[PDB]
Motif scaffolding. Sequence first.
Motif, mmCIF file in Angstrom:
data_model
loop_
_atom_site.group_PDB
_atom_site.id
_atom_site.type_symbol
_atom_site.label_atom_id
_atom_site.label_comp_id
_atom_site.label_asym_id
_atom_site.label_seq_id
_atom_site.Cartn_x
_atom_site.Cartn_y
_atom_site.Cartn_z
ATOM 1 N N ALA A 1 5.505 0.419 -5.799
ATOM 2 C CA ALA A 1 4.590 -0.197 -4.841
ATOM 3 C C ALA A 1 3.348 -0.616 -5.645
ATOM 4 O O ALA A 1 2.689 0.244 -6.265
ATOM 5 C CB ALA A 1 4.199 0.783 -3.755
ATOM 6 N N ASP B 1 0.896 -1.135 0.000
ATOM 7 C CA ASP B 1 0.000 0.000 0.000
ATOM 8 C C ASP B 1 0.975 1.235 0.000
ATOM 9 O O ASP B 1 1.664 1.471 1.002
ATOM 10 C CB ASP B 1 -0.828 -0.070 1.293
ATOM 11 N N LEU C 1 -1.759 -9.084 -9.142
ATOM 12 C CA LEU C 1 -1.080 -8.299 -10.189
ATOM 13 C C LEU C 1 0.415 -8.308 -9.927
ATOM 14 O O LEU C 1 1.209 -8.524 -10.856
ATOM 15 C CB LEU C 1 -1.606 -6.839 -10.227
ATOM 16 N N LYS D 1 4.167 6.666 4.681
ATOM 17 C CA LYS D 1 4.193 7.015 6.116
ATOM 18 C C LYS D 1 5.353 6.385 6.860
ATOM 19 O O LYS D 1 5.903 6.989 7.784
ATOM 20 C CB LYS D 1 2.884 6.613 6.801
ATOM 21 N N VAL E 1 0.445 4.335 0.418
ATOM 22 C CA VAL E 1 0.222 5.321 1.501
ATOM 23 C C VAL E 1 0.962 4.866 2.736
ATOM 24 O O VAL E 1 1.636 5.653 3.375
ATOM 25 C CB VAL E 1 -1.284 5.528 1.791
ATOM 26 N N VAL F 1 -4.724 5.715 -6.787
ATOM 27 C CA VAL F 1 -3.625 6.214 -5.984
ATOM 28 C C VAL F 1 -3.804 7.702 -5.618
ATOM 29 O O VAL F 1 -3.549 8.072 -4.473
ATOM 30 C CB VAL F 1 -2.285 5.977 -6.738
ATOM 31 N N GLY G 1 -4.428 0.159 -13.889
ATOM 32 C CA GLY G 1 -5.718 0.296 -13.233
ATOM 33 C C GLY G 1 -6.741 1.044 -14.048
ATOM 34 O O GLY G 1 -6.955 0.729 -15.228
#
Length: 164
Positions: free
Chosen positions: A150, A18, A156, A24, A20, A45, A126
Amino acid sequence: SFSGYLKLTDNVYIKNADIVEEAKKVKPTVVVNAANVYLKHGGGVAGALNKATNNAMQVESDDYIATNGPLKVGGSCVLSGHNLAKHCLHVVGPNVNKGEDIQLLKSAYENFNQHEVLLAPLLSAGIFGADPIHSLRVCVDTVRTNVYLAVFDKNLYDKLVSSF
Ligand SMILES: Cn1c(C(=O)O)c(NC(=O)c2ccc(NC(=O)NC3CC3)cc2)c2cccnc21
Protein backbone atom coordinates in the motif's frame (compact mmCIF):
# COMPACT_ATOMS: atom_id res chain seq x y z
CA SER A 1 -10.42 -9.74 0.35
CA PHE A 2 -7.63 -7.60 -1.23
CA SER A 3 -9.09 -5.65 -4.20
CA GLY A 4 -7.94 -2.93 -6.65
CA TYR A 5 -4.25 -4.01 -6.66
CA LEU A 6 -1.92 -3.86 -9.74
CA LYS A 7 0.10 -7.08 -10.26
CA LEU A 8 3.90 -6.47 -10.43
CA THR A 9 5.27 -10.06 -10.24
CA ASP A 10 3.85 -13.60 -9.53
CA ASN A 11 3.76 -12.74 -5.75
CA VAL A 12 3.99 -8.88 -5.42
CA TYR A 13 0.96 -6.54 -5.81
CA ILE A 14 0.64 -2.74 -5.30
CA LYS A 15 -2.19 -0.23 -4.64
CA ASN A 16 -2.37 3.56 -4.09
CA ALA A 17 -4.01 3.34 -0.72
CA ASP A 18 -4.03 4.43 2.93
CA ILE A 19 -2.70 1.27 4.77
CA VAL A 20 -4.88 2.05 7.86
CA GLU A 21 -8.08 2.12 5.78
CA GLU A 22 -6.92 -0.94 3.85
CA ALA A 23 -6.32 -2.83 7.14
CA LYS A 24 -9.80 -1.86 8.53
CA LYS A 25 -11.47 -3.04 5.33
CA VAL A 26 -9.58 -6.34 4.83
CA LYS A 27 -8.62 -7.22 8.45
CA PRO A 28 -5.65 -9.29 7.19
CA THR A 29 -3.83 -12.01 9.10
CA VAL A 30 -0.65 -9.81 9.10
CA VAL A 31 -0.16 -6.05 8.69
CA VAL A 32 3.52 -4.92 8.53
CA ASN A 33 4.62 -1.84 10.52
CA ALA A 34 7.67 0.22 9.36
CA ALA A 35 9.18 0.28 12.88
CA ASN A 36 12.37 1.64 14.56
CA VAL A 37 14.49 -0.53 17.00
CA TYR A 38 12.75 1.00 20.05
CA LEU A 39 9.16 0.42 18.73
CA LYS A 40 8.46 4.18 19.31
CA HIS A 41 5.58 4.76 16.83
CA GLY A 42 5.80 8.54 16.36
CA GLY A 43 5.45 9.37 12.68
CA GLY A 44 4.85 7.87 9.24
CA VAL A 45 3.15 4.49 8.93
CA ALA A 46 4.07 3.58 12.56
CA GLY A 47 2.37 6.68 13.99
CA ALA A 48 -0.68 6.19 11.76
CA LEU A 49 -1.12 2.49 12.69
CA ASN A 50 -0.63 3.28 16.42
CA LYS A 51 -3.15 6.15 16.29
CA ALA A 52 -5.81 3.81 14.68
CA THR A 53 -5.34 1.38 17.67
CA ASN A 54 -6.07 4.26 20.13
CA ASN A 55 -2.41 3.86 21.41
CA ALA A 56 -2.89 0.16 22.37
CA MET A 57 -0.05 -0.75 19.94
CA GLN A 58 2.38 1.62 21.78
CA VAL A 59 1.43 0.26 25.28
CA GLU A 60 2.02 -3.33 24.05
CA SER A 61 5.29 -2.31 22.33
CA ASP A 62 6.64 -0.59 25.48
CA ASP A 63 6.03 -3.83 27.50
CA TYR A 64 7.82 -5.87 24.76
CA ILE A 65 10.89 -3.54 24.86
CA ALA A 66 10.93 -3.49 28.69
CA THR A 67 11.16 -7.34 28.61
CA ASN A 68 13.41 -8.00 25.60
CA GLY A 69 15.42 -4.85 24.80
CA PRO A 70 15.49 -3.24 21.33
CA LEU A 71 15.24 -4.98 17.95
CA LYS A 72 18.22 -5.21 15.55
CA VAL A 73 18.23 -3.04 12.35
CA GLY A 74 16.98 -5.61 9.76
CA GLY A 75 15.05 -7.53 12.47
CA SER A 76 11.40 -7.99 13.44
CA CYS A 77 8.91 -9.13 16.11
CA VAL A 78 5.29 -10.35 15.90
CA LEU A 79 2.80 -8.58 18.18
CA SER A 80 -1.04 -8.18 18.20
CA GLY A 81 -2.74 -6.44 15.25
CA HIS A 82 -5.40 -5.02 17.64
CA ASN A 83 -8.43 -3.68 15.56
CA LEU A 84 -6.42 -3.71 12.27
CA ALA A 85 -5.25 -7.29 11.74
CA LYS A 86 -4.78 -10.65 13.59
CA HIS A 87 -1.03 -9.81 13.98
CA CYS A 88 1.37 -6.86 13.34
CA LEU A 89 4.85 -7.77 12.11
CA HIS A 90 7.06 -4.86 13.23
CA VAL A 91 10.00 -4.75 10.75
CA VAL A 92 13.01 -2.45 11.08
CA GLY A 93 14.48 -1.25 7.81
CA PRO A 94 17.65 0.87 7.81
CA ASN A 95 17.29 4.60 8.44
CA VAL A 96 19.67 6.06 5.86
CA ASN A 97 19.17 9.55 7.45
CA LYS A 98 20.98 8.09 10.58
CA GLY A 99 23.87 6.44 8.64
CA GLU A 100 22.41 2.90 8.90
CA ASP A 101 23.71 0.46 6.27
CA ILE A 102 21.39 0.17 3.16
CA GLN A 103 22.48 -3.50 2.73
CA LEU A 104 20.30 -4.28 5.81
CA LEU A 105 17.18 -3.54 3.69
CA LYS A 106 17.43 -7.04 2.08
CA SER A 107 17.63 -8.56 5.62
CA ALA A 108 14.54 -6.53 6.66
CA TYR A 109 12.44 -7.89 3.72
CA GLU A 110 13.56 -11.49 4.49
CA ASN A 111 11.30 -11.29 7.62
CA PHE A 112 8.24 -11.26 5.23
CA ASN A 113 9.12 -14.83 4.09
CA GLN A 114 7.96 -16.24 7.49
CA HIS A 115 4.30 -15.33 6.62
CA GLU A 116 2.11 -16.63 3.77
CA VAL A 117 0.41 -13.29 3.03
CA LEU A 118 1.07 -9.70 4.23
CA LEU A 119 -0.39 -6.17 3.83
CA ALA A 120 2.72 -3.89 3.93
CA PRO A 121 4.30 -0.47 3.29
CA LEU A 122 7.63 0.05 1.36
CA LEU A 123 10.43 -0.29 3.94
CA SER A 124 13.06 2.46 4.50
CA ALA A 125 11.10 4.85 2.16
CA GLY A 126 9.85 8.33 3.24
CA ILE A 127 11.37 9.62 6.48
CA PHE A 128 13.84 6.67 6.59
CA GLY A 129 15.58 8.39 3.57
CA ALA A 130 16.15 5.47 1.18
CA ASP A 131 15.18 5.61 -2.56
CA PRO A 132 11.64 4.06 -2.83
CA ILE A 133 12.41 2.67 -6.32
CA HIS A 134 15.39 0.78 -4.75
CA SER A 135 13.17 -0.44 -1.86
CA LEU A 136 10.58 -1.88 -4.34
CA ARG A 137 13.39 -3.63 -6.31
CA VAL A 138 14.80 -5.24 -3.10
CA CYS A 139 11.21 -6.29 -2.14
CA VAL A 140 10.53 -8.08 -5.48
CA ASP A 141 13.96 -9.77 -5.52
CA THR A 142 13.73 -10.95 -1.85
CA VAL A 143 10.12 -11.74 -0.83
CA ARG A 144 8.74 -15.15 -2.04
CA THR A 145 5.40 -15.06 -0.11
CA ASN A 146 2.32 -13.00 -1.19
CA VAL A 147 2.83 -9.29 -0.43
CA TYR A 148 0.20 -6.54 -0.97
CA LEU A 149 1.93 -3.15 -0.94
CA ALA A 150 0.00 0.00 0.00
CA VAL A 151 1.58 3.30 -1.17
CA PHE A 152 -0.07 6.49 0.18
CA ASP A 153 1.29 9.22 -2.19
CA LYS A 154 -0.33 9.15 -5.70
CA ASN A 155 2.69 10.66 -7.46
CA LEU A 156 5.10 8.16 -5.82
CA TYR A 157 2.76 5.27 -6.73
CA ASP A 158 2.69 6.42 -10.42
CA LYS A 159 6.50 6.71 -10.51
CA LEU A 160 6.99 3.23 -8.94
CA VAL A 161 4.64 1.57 -11.42
CA SER A 162 5.99 3.35 -14.57
CA SER A 163 9.68 2.76 -13.71
CA PHE A 164 9.34 -0.90 -12.60
C1 LIG B 1 6.13 6.60 1.97
N1 LIG B 1 5.31 7.16 3.04
C2 LIG B 1 4.09 6.69 3.51
C3 LIG B 1 3.29 5.61 2.84
O1 LIG B 1 2.35 5.15 3.61
O2 LIG B 1 3.45 5.23 1.66
C4 LIG B 1 3.75 7.41 4.64
N2 LIG B 1 2.50 7.23 5.28
C5 LIG B 1 1.83 8.08 6.11
O3 LIG B 1 2.33 9.11 6.53
C6 LIG B 1 0.45 7.66 6.52
C7 LIG B 1 -0.31 8.61 7.20
C8 LIG B 1 -1.62 8.34 7.56
C9 LIG B 1 -2.19 7.12 7.25
N3 LIG B 1 -3.58 6.89 7.43
C10 LIG B 1 -4.41 7.26 8.46
O4 LIG B 1 -4.03 7.85 9.47
N4 LIG B 1 -5.69 6.89 8.27
C11 LIG B 1 -6.74 7.14 9.26
C12 LIG B 1 -7.24 8.52 9.42
C13 LIG B 1 -8.10 7.49 8.79
C14 LIG B 1 -1.42 6.15 6.61
C15 LIG B 1 -0.11 6.42 6.25
C16 LIG B 1 4.78 8.37 4.89
C17 LIG B 1 5.09 9.35 5.83
C18 LIG B 1 6.24 10.10 5.68
C19 LIG B 1 7.05 9.87 4.59
N5 LIG B 1 6.82 8.93 3.66
C20 LIG B 1 5.72 8.20 3.85
